[PDB]
Write a protein that binds this ligand. Structure first.
Ligand SMILES: [Mg+2]
Ligand SMILES: [Mg+2]
Ligand SMILES: [Mg+2]
Lengths: 108, 71, 140, 59, 155, 40, 43, 153, 148
């Protein structure tokens, strides 16, 4: 039992050399994550907008949520939420919007 | 020195050339000894005959092998 | 015999067709377009020359990334892969690093093992003791 | 290995949060590996044009 | 024994396995890989192959583009001999520095022998009235790699 | 890199030098008949 | 703040650019090569 | 229709409305297939089918044209068929839970044995991807499977 | 110039060469003249090598049209629907044969910059690198500073 690299991450590498000496083989089966190294899936299900009087209005109580902000505050919120700068969210002019490729090439 | 390098047949760098060990060429080798690497030609298997001219090679250690890539 | 040029439209168009994506008056005025097109072609040649170097540096950076991901430095990894007579260039090594994590880990393990083999040989300074992966095979 | 295109893309280009203790540590040696992580030079999928970059929290 | 900061080297000590044990373990591993190849538990393979001066990572049903013209007609099958690396999900064969022709066989069919797009090479020198424009069209050859085979002839 | 090690071992400083990576024919027909020889 | 008078590598006062360990090692390697050359050029 | 148009069946097909709507193109292509079956052997027609229709599956996934709706459900019925009790979904790895772009890895454990794993933006999507991966592994359609055999028996 | 012209990836039509090879050249229409001095090469190619080429390649329909024209042309139409028109004006028979062989060997795809000299479907055999493919798992999946 000897290995240059630890067998703790994704595969178990075992190196060997052919008796002829011109070929190197390496048997490296995948390593599965054992059960003791996992945690259960959190599930969050809570409906606080339900009303015993009118569930028809209670259903819309969870869907009537809306909000509108100015350009500055909206860009600041987006930058804070995505951990970027404020200059990425500003629009671009006609010269740059016209020169974009309509049908970019795609691989795979 | 440019002329000595030209007359020694060393225009292309990193390309070996075979020369005699006579003082006539040794004088020019001494003249331009700061621009060239010089090794002794080694013949472990002897001089190549006329039947081994197309199967010869020059290993980088300074020797000339006459039987190269046998089949 | 008065001789005038009639294909001047096509002569101008052959130059203007390469400058239609430029910014400003360089895409319209011919006097400003010939200089812009010539510099564009010169830059194209220079960048074609530099593309090999840039992609080689990118491959080296990726090989590093995948190597210190295995706790091995790039120079040691490369020299110990060469010592094992494994002649895989940087492009192929980067391809393996990106798409073959297990194969790249096997290569890293082989390079490391060669490194400790060389270190043990240097420490011992004995002609008889030779490592398993340090044996040199000739051409056949 | 046999993932769909979108989940494979998300797994490949997912962002990672690293922790770095700064007690009795030199700023140069801390911030060198910090800069490596912020650039993404620890990823074999790294590219200058790509947005491959990870978060680092130094305490 | 005195234990100082510089008394011991700043790296963990390395112990190598015994030579006979290493040879026996190598024999066991190579026999296991040979049994895997013979029984055919391998699904798909990739191979690093030297061709036309470059090294290509190629799997089955692949397309590669070569920048020079080959002396073959279209639709012809060609056996690539210089195989540097073979790999599958569970094993991988490394050559020193090449694999065996009897051990690995890779075949590719020639699809298209075409010409490159016009590449512009222009040299220009400042205030010397020196311009030099050339257009290069390079014959290319497209190869579709169909299958990669490995034989259990591996001691 | 790795030029000094190759020179000590006897191989060329460049893997392209007289090695099997370049001397051998890099392709052949599927039938097994030899390919036309290489200009280099 | 710190100015180099005249041009950088011409005037009486030049840049104090020093010699490096890499340069020293390169010179020693070239000297060893030339010593081997003049040894082979002896007999 | 793509195969016929690239094989120039559309140009040779005698029909009005030169666009040749896809029912007409499909009918003409399959009429050509039937003519080949009548003229040559069934083995030759099978070879032609394998060469000109199965090659369109190269690089494609299974669910891309299967389009199933309940991957976890079909996985549990498949495990019931294969005499496996039930898979348990467990969060294996994750990076960020309060960020705008969380990534989660969900694995499936049958008898505390990991059979598959899947990444996702949210936990539900990761679980669905893990179920899809387990289903593909069970059905044998995997990225590391044997490539199709294109030979002459 | 890459930024000035279009670009495409290394592709093949109908996955050609996988099951069987199909010659992508569908038809070749030569237009020449019998009295024009420029059509000499086209005429002599028609006399000498058009029959041999037709016998060698039976999958291409060859049309030849003499007409009062000054610029001899060749129209190659491929299975892709692509039409490539070349000028065979004042070219020797060797050059015309070379051009015809090149047209036959071409696949009919656009002659533009190919982004990559290679094209594989599913290169992620054995897995693809993701940041978690080389990090060890901790007991219980705990965070670095999370206490259970
Ligand atoms: Mg060059
Ligand atoms: Mg000054
Ligand atoms: Mg000065």
């Amino acid at each position: 039992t000897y290995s240059s690299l630890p067998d703790d991450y994704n595969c178990k590498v075992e190196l060997a050399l052919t008796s002829d000496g011109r070929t190197i083989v390496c048997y490296h089966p995948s390593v599965d994550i054992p059960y003791e190294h996992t945690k259960p899936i959190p599930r969050p299900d809570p409906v606080h907008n339900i009303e015993e009087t009118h569930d028809l209005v209670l259903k819309t109580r969870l869907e009537e949520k809306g909000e509108h902000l100015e350009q500055g505050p909206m860009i600041e919120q987006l930058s804070k939420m995505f951990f970027t700068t404020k200059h990425r969210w500003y629009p671009r002019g006609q010269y740059h919007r016209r020169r974009r490729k309509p049908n970019p090439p795609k691989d795979r | 020195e440019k002329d000595i390098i030209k007359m020694l047949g060393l225009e292309k760098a990193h390309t070996p050339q075979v020369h005699k060990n006579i003082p006539s060429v040794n004088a020019k080798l001494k003249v331009v000894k700061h621009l060239i690497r010089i090794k002794p030609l080694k013949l472990p298997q002897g001089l190549p005959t006329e039947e081994d001219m197309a199967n010869t090679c020059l290993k980088s250690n300074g020797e000339l092998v006459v039987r190269w890539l046998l089949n | 015999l008065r001789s005038r040029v009639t294909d001047r439209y096509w002569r101008v168009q052959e130059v203007l067709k390469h400058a239609r994506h430029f910014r400003g008056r360089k895409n319209r005025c011919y006097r400003l377009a010939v200089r812009a097109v010539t510099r564009a072609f010169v830059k194209c040649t220079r960048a074609r020359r530099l593309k090999k170097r840039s992609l080689r540096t990118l491959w080296i950076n990726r090989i590093t990334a995948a190597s210190q991901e295995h706790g091995l430095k790039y120079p040691a990894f490369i020299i110990n892969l060469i010592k094992c007579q494994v002649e895989l260039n940087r492009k192929v090594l980067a391809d393996l690093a990106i798409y073959e994590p297990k194969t790249f880990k096997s290569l890293a393990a082989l390079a490391k093992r060669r490194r400790e083999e060389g270190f043990a040989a240097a420490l011992g300074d004995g002609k008889e003791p030779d490592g398993i992966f340090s044996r040199v095979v000739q051409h056949r | 290995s046999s993932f769909s295109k979108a989940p494979q893309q998300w797994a490949t280009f997912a962002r990672v949060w690293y922790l770095l203790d700064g007690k009795m540590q030199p700023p140069g040696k801390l911030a060198a590996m910090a800069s490596v992580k912020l650039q993404g030079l620890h990823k074999p999928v790294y590219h200058q044009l790509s947005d491959c970059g990870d978060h680092v929290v130094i305490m | 024994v005195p234990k100082t900061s510089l008394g011991s080297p700043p790296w963990p000590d390395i112990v190598l396995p015994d030579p006979v044990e290493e040879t026996r373990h190598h024999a066991e591993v190579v026999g296991q890989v040979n049994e895997l190849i013979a029984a055919g538990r391998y699904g798909r393979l990739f191979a690093v192959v030297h061709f036309a001066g470059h090294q290509w990572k190629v799997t089955a049903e692949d397309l590669i583009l070569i920048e020079n013209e080959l002396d073959v007609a279209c639709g012809e099958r060609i056996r690539l001999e210089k195989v540097l690396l073979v790999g599958a999900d569970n094993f991988t064969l490394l050559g020193k520095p090449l694999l065996g022709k009897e051990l690995v066989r890779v075949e590719a069919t020639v699809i298209e022998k075409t010409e490159s797009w016009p590449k512009i090479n222009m040299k220009f020198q400042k205030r010397k009235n020196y311009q030099r424009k050339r257009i290069t069209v390079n014959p290319q050859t497209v190869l579709r790699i169909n299958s990669i085979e490995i034989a259990p002839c591996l001691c | 890199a790795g030029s000094q090690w190759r020179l000590q071992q006897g191989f060329a400083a460049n893997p392209s030098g007289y090695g099997p990576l370049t001397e051998l024919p890099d392709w052949s027909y599927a039938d097994g008949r030899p390919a036309p020889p290489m200009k280099g | 703040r710190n100015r180099i008078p005249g041009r950088q590598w011409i005037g009486k006062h030049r840049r104090p650019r020093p010699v490096s360990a890499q340069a020293k090692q390169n010179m020693i390697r070239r000297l060893e090569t030339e010593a081997e050359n003049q040894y082979w050029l002896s007999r | 229709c793509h195969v016929a148009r690239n094989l120039a069946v559309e140009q040779l097909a005698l029909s009005a409305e030169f666009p040749v709507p896809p029912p007409v193109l499909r009918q003409t292509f399959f009429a050509v297939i039937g003519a080949l079956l009548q003229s040559s052997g069934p083995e030759r027609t099978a070879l032609f089918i394998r060469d000109f229709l199965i090659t369109q599956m190269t690089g494609k996934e299974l669910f891309e044209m299967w389009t199933i709706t309940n991957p976890m459900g079909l996985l549990v019925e498949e495990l019931k068929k294969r005499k496996i009790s039930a898979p348990e979904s467990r969060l294996t790895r994750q990076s960020g839970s309060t960020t705008a772009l969380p990534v989660y890895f969900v694995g499936l454990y049958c008898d505390r044995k990991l059979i598959a794993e899947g990444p996702g933006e949210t936990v539900l999507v990761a679980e669905e991807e893990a179920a899809r991966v387990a289903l593909r592994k069970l059905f044998g359609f995997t990225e590391n499977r044997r490539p199709w055999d294109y030979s002459k028996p | 110039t890459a930024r000035g012209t279009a670009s495409r990836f290394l592709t093949s039509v109908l996955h050609n060469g996988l099951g069987r090879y199909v010659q992508q050249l569908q038809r070749l229409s030569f237009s020449l003249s019998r009295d024009a001095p420029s059509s000499r090469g086209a005429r002599e190619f028609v006399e000498r090598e058009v029959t041999d080429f037709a016998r060698r390649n039976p999958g291409v329909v060859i049309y030849v049209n003499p007409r009062p024209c000054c610029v001899p042309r060749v129209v190659a139409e491929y299975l892709n629907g692509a039409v490539r028109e070349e000028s065979i004006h004042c070219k020797s028979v060797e050059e015309i044969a070379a051009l015809v062989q090149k047209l036959a060997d071409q696949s009919g795809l656009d002659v533009i910059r190919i982004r990559k000299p290679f094209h594989t479907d599913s290169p992620s055999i054995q897995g693809q690198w993701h940041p978690f493919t080389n990090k060890p798992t901790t007991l219980g999946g705990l965070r670095p500073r999370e206490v259970q």
